[PDB]
Amino acid sequence: FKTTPVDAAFVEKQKKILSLFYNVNEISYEAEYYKVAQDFNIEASKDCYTNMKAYENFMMMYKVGFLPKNLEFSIFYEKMREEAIALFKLFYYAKDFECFYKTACYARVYMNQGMFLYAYYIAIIQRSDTASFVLPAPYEAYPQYFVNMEVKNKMDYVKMMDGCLDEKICYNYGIIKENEQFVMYANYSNSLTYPNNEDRIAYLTEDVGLNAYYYYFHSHLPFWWNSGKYGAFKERRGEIYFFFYQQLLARYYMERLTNGLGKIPEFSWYSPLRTGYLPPFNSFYYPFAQRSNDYELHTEKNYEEIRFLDIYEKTFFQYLQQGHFKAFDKKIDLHSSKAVNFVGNYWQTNADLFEEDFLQFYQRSYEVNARRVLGAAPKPFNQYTFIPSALDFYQTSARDPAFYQLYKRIVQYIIEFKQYQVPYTQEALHFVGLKISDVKVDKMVTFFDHFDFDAFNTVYFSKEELKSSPHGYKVRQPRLNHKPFTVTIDIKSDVATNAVVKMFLGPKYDENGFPFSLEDNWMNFYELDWFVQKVNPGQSQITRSSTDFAFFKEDSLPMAEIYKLLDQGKIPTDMFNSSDTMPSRLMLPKGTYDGFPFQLFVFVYPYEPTPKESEPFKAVVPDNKPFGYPFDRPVLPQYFKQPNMFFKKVLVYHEGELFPYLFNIPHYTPDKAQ
Amino acid sequence: IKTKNVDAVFVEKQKKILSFFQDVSQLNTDDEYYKIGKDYDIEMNMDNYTNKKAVEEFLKMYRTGFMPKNLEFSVFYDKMRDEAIALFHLFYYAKDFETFYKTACFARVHLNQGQFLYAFYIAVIQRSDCHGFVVPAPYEVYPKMFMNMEVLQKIYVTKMQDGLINPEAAAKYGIHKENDYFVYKANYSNAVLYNNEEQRLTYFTEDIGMNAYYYYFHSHLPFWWTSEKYGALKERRGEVYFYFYQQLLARYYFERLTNGLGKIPEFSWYSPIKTGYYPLMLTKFTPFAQRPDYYNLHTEENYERVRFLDTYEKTFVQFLQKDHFEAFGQKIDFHDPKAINFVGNYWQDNADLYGEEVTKDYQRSYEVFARRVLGAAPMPFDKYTFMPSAMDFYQTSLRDPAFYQLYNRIVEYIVEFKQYLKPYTQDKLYFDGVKITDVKVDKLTTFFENFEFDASNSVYFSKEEIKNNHVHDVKVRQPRLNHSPFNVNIEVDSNVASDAVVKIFLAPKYDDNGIPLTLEDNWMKFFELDWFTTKLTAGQNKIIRNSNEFVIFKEDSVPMTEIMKMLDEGKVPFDMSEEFCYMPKRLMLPRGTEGGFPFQLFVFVYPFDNKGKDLAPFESFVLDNKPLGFPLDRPVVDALFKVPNMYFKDIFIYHEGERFPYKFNIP
């Protein structure tokens, strides 16, 4: 519930930014943004931009025309990408906030909804003056991607009937009036959307924050954008790539573990993919593409793409087999520091992997092609109209099990390369004159909580209604969550030093009930937190609350609540400092009444600062150390018995109901955690 | 246009009927049906039903619980089906109109609307007091199943917005307000998706008439109900089955030809199936299931289903291996053409296959499970919760290439039986001293024309809007195929005054390589257009027959509002009152080409049983007991067949105007 103060100039500018997220699916002919848009003469505005070549480029594509309103926009299709990147460059190179805003009002009014939102979200995140301003949560901007079609439909019907037929009847269908607004209860999906064991974890993969999280990841550093803005970070880009996915997959594999699901399965482009998924969405023209269980990847429609994909991976194998090779106009050694970066950019086909300021249409991307084949859609009708899968959007990608299958496949390939890195030696890890004597944690408890957000942006309003910037329509759904807990660390030091304290969470046992060995477990640990303590000689005890963990955040406030906070000169400080991290809700994987066993790994090493990175991301240790150190590479497990290391077995309990559905039953009062 | 007159008593009853097809998704609590419905007690009225056993069974089943109001009813699933059938029994065994009506009022009020409408539509058709009555075309009753989701969504958008926000902008999307209707132009699925060559045929396979047609076919004669009611017809049931598909399939094949698409594809349950279907339709819960190209039928989920299906076929193969056998308590001999009955009933697995009034769950349907596996949906969640596919409904079945591929398979097996039958001989077919000396046909020309249908039943209204009888009416318009009327002039030399039957068939000229088509192996590609009778005088005669008079087809259904107007004028539509279960007239010809696609017409004149008396159409067919499709109901031998009372005219189907339906829908 934490805030940050803000003056009137901010408030007024902020409000201007947010005003464009109102009733995104329509136009209020009475809005201020509409007057600005009408007043804006795009052909006479060359002087609004600091880059005339970008403006000229836009005006050219614009003279021929863009993606029409009402078609689905996706970053994964070439022409739409060029157009969206072009729009973004105008947003970005606008000289001023006033020029930025006029341009944004223009695009808001005259361009495809999805395109505009896409570029506007990114621009705000990216523009120097505009960063430090808050954005509505991805699910409040794009409800259509965060709301399964049962509810979305009920919403259509409720709006068409301007309320309920008879209030008791739609109490039974989970629809409520609460404070002049509607609330629809929403369950997670059937086996008619997840038609296999994967359904056990719908509550994770359909989770709105998880999905938001991935969308924020993309938006902070789009594959198509070079690193110029982040200077010295350019060097660490590929390294992020690995860390982001490795880390995400670890979090995901933990959920599997507590639902008895075991290892994410391998697959092949020459065989059928066992595990299907039926996205519960529809676009303007099309229901989303369904991928049934045992879907044949290898058919006529996909042959040429499979040829592409196969060689793409096999050339990585050739790079591993040589060790030094000239590739992409560089001479690159895989014992080199620069290697980690290369690898990452190679798999993502970055703008950085090439010359490029902005990615050339013609540089074929393994991720792009992978998502087309796994999405299982029919081939696009023309280049403005394609049949959407979940893999077509960062908002929806984490929903399809095939997503984790793809990125696990990538991560394994990079781990294959990671054999070329030099495993940390003993004195390397050994912190001289520093020992952790004990670690102690509070009770770790997961549980479920209803959570609300306003889905009004996917609901339609009348000419009259739009004047009021109407937003009646809320989705209440049980989401994972845990109680706050503290870790206390007992330390003995010879000397006063400065130390970094990192603590990770990972698995304890196989699916066979065997202890994981570190040589096989290191990729399965995810970072919870890091910080810097001045450490005194003698015995000390460091306490750390789950509330202060570096890698997690509070939920976003609805746009309504943001405005209510501006009215009293404030902003939600997590939405401010760190919108791009995992929600704290999802910090722990769902536990059991037993207590599910995991290891908390605590690690203390010497703090040796470097000049602050200017960061596209999660502020990471002001260190020359890698991301996710010391788990950034294969280990020699002997070297992990150091006195400044501590593995502590920890059990995650659960409380109240065991399944989200038990919360959305009309007339049943659930067991709520206390 | 073609009407009929009706007393004020019929009028009150007809309007009572139609009130159940008016706002189907919602309940008007002020309305008369609701007051009646809510408190009506079936138990207290037990003695007002012919069949106590039926009503008891209903009350039992109903107190147990029916399907819920929000789900999607399909007849192809056991429990839902049984509920439906029980409800139907209730409607059917009602003593009189009044009780039937009170029974509907109840069901509308208390039950799933899909279930109710399925039940009611059939009851209206099947009740004897209700013969002469009229049901609205299925596309008005279930409009959501006769349009792609693009359009449906546009409808919902416009309603949420309480109108058009920027008329000019909306016009770009084929939406405009016209008086007090909102009008949506609707494109066929291939305007937005061409996944395989089958999309070439969408204007046929999606045509709201063709689909409605199949829906009527089922409603008139459901697989689960006995043909008892129809007396003598019962012994012909199988015959009607084969005929219906063999005809439909022939008509379909014609469409195939004129789009350069050839013979209907064969599949194997042990193999993937090459032809996918991507339904662009949905339900309040879920989208219809998609079948990708090269969808593998043989996966874990289907292993048992395939076993059953494979066996069902192998079983018939065994029947073919004996010629005479005992099955289902009958003794069958395949040399006997009347065995067609058994054969048709075997494949449909209908009530008349056993001696029963309704089918039972343990009497497992080949067609049900074929549909289920071809449909590619994942396994249903529970009994009321499944992912619909186009083959879960008769309204939608024609939309899927797989439908034709299935019934093709079945029909073929049935002709494997037809090979047992002795070919009609020279002297069975001769009409002594009569000769068709010439056939001349007018211009055969197809075209498209915009058609509108009232799609209002798809719109949800407000408490306040319902009592205000506020109007938000919705029309969907799309180009539908039609053709110009034409005459067939037949010149015949009768030696002597005789009464004759004339029959007219349409057939292909060549296959898709230009091999001319021989009766020996193409007899089942003959599509019957007309059956009529004529006095034939001595010397030279000439019959002139107009395509409007062709007996096998019907005019378009009139909309409910138009029917509603006619009732105030003691009028009712003729075609809808009697002739509803026939193919719509506009579709009789396949889409021709601008330069004249070649078919041929087969005219056949044969001796009619005098009657010694004057003649009326319906019983005139039953007086001569020629098998359906005579003389092309069994294999022909060309040389043994041709005769002077036969004639084959090469003909050409032209198309005029705009060739592609999307060009009508252009902004």
Ligand SMILES: *[C@@H]1O[C@H](CO)[C@@H](O[C@@H]2O[C@H](CO)[C@@H](O[C@@H]3O[C@H](CO[C@H]4O[C@H](CO)[C@@H](O)[C@H](O)[C@@H]4O)[C@@H](O)[C@H](O[C@H]4O[C@H](CO)[C@@H](O)[C@H](O)[C@@H]4O)[C@@H]3O)[C@H](O)[C@H]2NC(C)=O)[C@H](O)[C@H]1NC(C)=O
């Ligand atoms: C049924 O299905 C059909 C076929 O898919 C649809 O027909 C398409 O309709 C769309 C309009 O919705 C057409 O696209 C638009 O039409 C114009 C095309 O002009 C032609 O001729 C000019 C020369 O005058 C050529 O330059 C050009 O190559 C075209 O061949 C354009 O005027 C439109 O531009 C407008 O919108 C764009 C964005 O789309 C803006 O950037 C512009 O400022 C301008 O406002 C647009 O390109 C399309 O041509 C039709 N397809 C075909 C094959 O004819 C129907 O819409 C559909 N019906 C329904 C109810 O859905």
Ligand SMILES: *[C@@H]1O[C@H](CO)[C@@H](O[C@@H]2O[C@H](CO)[C@@H](O[C@@H]3O[C@H](CO[C@H]4O[C@H](CO)[C@@H](O)[C@H](O)[C@@H]4O)[C@@H](O)[C@H](O[C@H]4O[C@H](CO)[C@@H](O)[C@H](O)[C@@H]4O)[C@@H]3O)[C@H](O)[C@H]2NC(C)=O)[C@H](O)[C@H]1NC(C)=O
């Ligand atoms: C999220 O998903 C969950 C899990 O599926 C849904 O929970 C189901 O919700 C429905 C309510 O929508 C429940 O159905 C109801 O069951 C009640 C309990 O009944 C017991 O006792 C009755 C006799 O009273 C027995 O017949 C029965 O066997 C049980 O022993 C009933 O009291 C309810 O009565 C209703 O019945 C008829 C419909 O047949 C109505 O017309 C009546 O008016 C009356 O409302 C009702 O049938 C079901 O139990 C829940 N499932 C589970 C597994 O717990 C949530 O609804 C869903 N939430 C959302 C928002 O989708």
Ligand code: NA
């Ligand atoms: Na596509």
Ligand code: NA
């Ligand atoms: Na997976």
Ligand code: NA
């Ligand atoms: Na077939």
